[PDB]
């Protein structure tokens, strides 16, 4: 039900005018926290987090991620010498956070990846850092020496859970706010094949069921989707296409199932799509 | 891995009405990616690039959006450059599809 | 609320 995620990236080759280190925070899949190596500051991204937290909160977050930036800077140099790699593109990825399931079960996660492949993963049930690759064994030796397993256990089970419950309470109005999609039905004729398209513009929340219907019957297999893609303002977009015969286009209807709609919305090409209200 | 790209508008396209052209790329590694929004093969002004974020399988994703007014008889596209692509890939945006 | 920098050590 409720999730807290901290997405960290350390790069050797980021690109021109782009930061090498990026740290972003998410509450229920929505961005709220942001940090980059160029700005060197932890800043809010939503109105609900900024209005409910003071400057003292963002100061503690800045110094903790500034240190994380320095630690990951060392990690890129340590792992390149360990793997005996000579230049090129190398990436260190970090994933941290906790899930508060609807039944009350708490799941904790703290794992890393080197060059897009699993490196280390903390196992909460055994209190040990699992080394996925043979090059991740000296990392486990450093962890067993320091004894970070106990300090990480109390964070994922108590600290992470406490603050996620606060963020859920702060952003309850925004996360639960439903947004109706602007639907449009289109068609393209090519080599005796009529490709019908159905686009849903700016919907919230993210889960949606957009299906094609022929003579009032669902055509799941024949329909091709592009997945749920995000918009810059926070809303989502999706498109579903179907191959049909020319002169049969009006027999097809677009069905949209969403939380903002009390009943599934039916749309046709000739009726004007979403302009039919 | 090779990026999966799709180009779309924020609101349904209208004549001489302000909109936002979006270009989303996902499922790629390394994270270094060159994404360019074009207006008749010319890079569009004021392009906003999203912060580096990754999915379940550690594959990176980036959203590139720019405020624009769709002009009649103009072609809007998205150019993607990645080391796994060999040759640059261009994705066409259709206002009526 | 982010976790301490020492837990990012490799």
Residue numbers in the entry:
A (entry chain A): 2 to 278
B (entry chain B): 2 to 98
C (entry chain C): 1 to 10
Structure paper excerpt:
Highly polymorphic class I molecules encoded by the major histocompatibility complex (MHC) are crucial in the adaptive immune response to viruses and some intracellular bacteria, binding peptides inside the cell and presenting them on the cell surface to CD8 T lymphocytes. In contrast, chicken TAP genes are highly polymorphic, with each haplotype encoding a TAP molecule with a peptide-translocation specificity matching the peptide-binding specificity of the dominantly expressed class I molecule encoded by the BF2 gene, with the BF1 gene expressed poorly or not at all. In this paper, we find that two other haplotypes known to confer resistance to Marek's disease also have low cell surface expression and promiscuous peptide motifs, and examine the structural basis for promiscuous binding in three low expressing molecules. Second, we show that peptide-binding repertoire and level of cell surface expression are inversely correlated in both chickens and humans, indicating that this relationship is a fundamental property of class I molecules.
Crystal structures, based on heavy chain and β2-microglobulin (β2m) expressed in bacteria and refolded with synthetic peptides, showed that BF2*2101 remodels the binding site to accommodate two peptides with completely different sequences, including the anchor residues. Small residues bordering the groove lead to a large cavity in the middle of the groove, within which Asp24 and Arg9 can move, creating different configurations, as illustrated for the 11mer peptide GHAEEYGAETL and the 10mer peptide REVDEQLLSV. In BF2*2101, small residues like Gly68(human position 69), Ser69(70), Ser97(99), and Gly152(155) create a big cavity in the centre of the binding groove, allowing Asp24 and Arg9 to move. However, the two structures with the 10mers TAGQEDYDRL and TAGQSNYDRL display a completely different mode of binding, for which the P2 Ala does not interact with the MHC molecule at all (and therefore is not an anchor residue), with Arg9 interacting as a bridge between Asp24 and Pc-2 Asp. A further mode of binding is shown by the 10mer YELDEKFDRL, for which both anchor residues at positions P2 and Pc-2 are acidic. In this structure, the P2 Glu interacts with both Asp24 and Arg9, and Pc-2 Asp interacts with Arg9. These various modes of binding are presumably just a few out of many and illustrate the promiscuous binding of BF2*2101, unlike anything seen for mammalian class I molecules. In this article, we confirm and extend the finding that BF2*2101 binds 10mer and 11mer peptides with three anchor positions, with many different amino acids with different chemical characteristics, mostly charged and polar at positions P2 and Pc-2 (and hydrophobic at Pc), which is unlike any mammalian molecule described thus far. The structural analysis of BF2*2101 showed that this low expressing class I molecule achieves promiscuous binding by remodelling the peptide binding site in a way never described for a mammalian class I molecule.
